[PDB]
């Protein structure tokens, strides 16, 4: 009961696996000293490089020329950063417990005390997030539906090939509610409350960006920055 754009656009998603195993490989043995805040830098700069990784190959994206690219990465690298933590937590996480990008799974408690009082307020707010996903049913399917739903912002502006752009997001948007409509009927209004999270994670993002903005001029911080100091 699979929209045919929607299938497509799940041919693009990374190999979850494979990529759990990059990420651990990368954090532990390479490194031959970081404290248990540079692991969290490193852990959320490396899925960040699978992010960049999975939108410059996939399909329509690839469409575009580097400017366009950019100018799209740079609007919402942190909310995809935050949507697939979040989706983490949905489908691998269950409470008291978070599940990293690295099959890792660590307790809330456990890491309420390893960081500060702000940082708690986010993941918190996070898990306000996974509960409400998580009530309402939020598959795979819908997943990288808003995936793509926060890769084509109709708020990104002097686009080159604005058209293209305009164009996916009203498609996903299209396929999306034929789709929950469809495989969630009795959950009637779920569409509607699946797209109003799209300003929460983009509240979560903006709140994510200014604790680590802070702890980089702090000197705490170790391509995460870079797409920060743009």
């Known amino acids: ?8 656009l799940l041919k693009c998603e990374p190999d979850e696996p494979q990529v759990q195993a990059k990420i651990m490989a990368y954090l532990q043995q390479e490194q031959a000293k970081l404290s248990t805040f540079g692991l969290m830098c490193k852990m959320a700069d490396q899925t960040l490089f699978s992010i960049v990784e999975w939108a410059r190959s996939s399909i329509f994206f690839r469409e575009l020329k580097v400017d366009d690219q950019m100018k799209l990465l740079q609007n919402c690298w942190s909310e995809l950063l935050i949507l697939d933590h979040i989706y983490r937590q949905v489908v691998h996480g269950k409470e008291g417990s978070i599940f990293l990008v690295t099959g ?3 307790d809330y408690s456990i890491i309420a005390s390893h960081t500060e009082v ?12 996974v509960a409400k996903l998580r009530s309402l049913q939020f598959d795979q399917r819908e997943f990288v539906c808003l995936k793509f739903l926060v890769l084509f912002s109709l708020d990104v502006k002097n686009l080159e090939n604005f ?3 305009e164009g ?3 498609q996903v948007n299209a396929a999306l509610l034929d789709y ?3 495989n969630y009927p009795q959950q009637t209004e779920k569409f509607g409350q699946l797209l109003l ?3 929460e994670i983009r509240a979560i993002s903006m709140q994510a960006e200014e604790y680590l903005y802070y702890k980089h001029l702090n000197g705490d911080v170790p391509l995460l920055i870079e797409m920060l100091h743009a």
């Open 197 to 199: 999270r799209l300003p």
């Open 180 to 182: 929950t409509m469809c």
């Open 1 to 8: 009961s699979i929209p045919h754009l929607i299938l497509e």
């Open 104 to 106: 890792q799974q660590v």
């Open 168 to 170: 996916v997001q009203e």
């Open 118 to 129: 702000a940082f708690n307020n986010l993941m918190s707010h996070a898990q306000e997030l």
């Open 163 to 165: 058209q293209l752009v």
